[PDB]
Structure 1
């Protein structure tokens, strides 16, 4: 589990969104595994606006933050899980790292701010849903 709290927005994995998230929906995209809902309080996370390929992510199944190198956001085939059938997921970045289903929501960050959240995993790989192209998170 985990979310990004920026301005009056809450960014979560779409497959982990709650009824309150759907009842206060701002935007959702199944192909990206992302859902954004509105919040009453303002959040403290800052979104990175950059092309970094090195950063650090939080892995709840190890209670540790790991430094990683990660690929550029791309269209990647992801195998079937309990949340999605086998399909192409867009704006996804991969790194070598430990991940379990419950690690989804962990933040990946670089020197500029939050880059994305854990969304996929298995066999020593971890995939992150990018949020750096969602410029509207910084306003309104």
Structure 2
């Protein structure tokens, strides 16, 4: 589990979005495994605006943050998981690291702020859903 709280926005994994998220929808993409809902209180997180390929991510199944190198966001085939079938996921970054289903929503951060959240795992990789490209999460 986990979310990004930027301005009046909650960024979550689409597959973990609640009824309240859906009832306060601002934007979803099922190929990006992202959903954004509106908040009443403002959030503490800053979104990275950069093309960094190094950062640190939180792994709840280890209670540990790991420094990782990761690929640039791309369209990638993902094998079946407990929460999605085998499918193409867009805007996905991969690193060598530990990721189980419940690690989804852990932040990846670089020197510039929040890069994305854990979205995939298995076979010794962790996959992150990029948010740097959503410039609107930092704007009105």
Q: Structure 1 length normalisation: TM-score? A: 0.98
Instruction: State the SS of the aligned residue for 1:41.
Output: coil
For the aligned residues, what is the CA RMSD?
0.6
Provide Cα deviations, 1:34-85, integer angstroms capped at 9, x if missing partner: 0000000000100000000000000000000000000000000001223222
Gaps of 5+ in 1: none
CA apart distance, 1:87: 1.1
How far did residue 108 of structure 1 move? 0.1
Distance 1:122 1:78 in 2: 9
Counterparts of 2:25 and 2:119 in 1: how far apart (Å)?
19
Could you tell me which residue of structure 1 aligns to residue 56 of structure 2?
56
SS class of match (2:102): helix
In 2, the alpha carbon distance for the partners of 1:97 and 1:80 equals 18
Structure 1 residues 86-110: Cα deviation after superposition (integer angstroms, max 9, x where no partner): 1110000000001110000000000
Bigger strand fraction:
1
Query: Normalised by the size of structure 2, how large is the TM-score?
Result: 0.98
For structure 2, the residue ranges without an aligned partner over 5 or more in a row are none
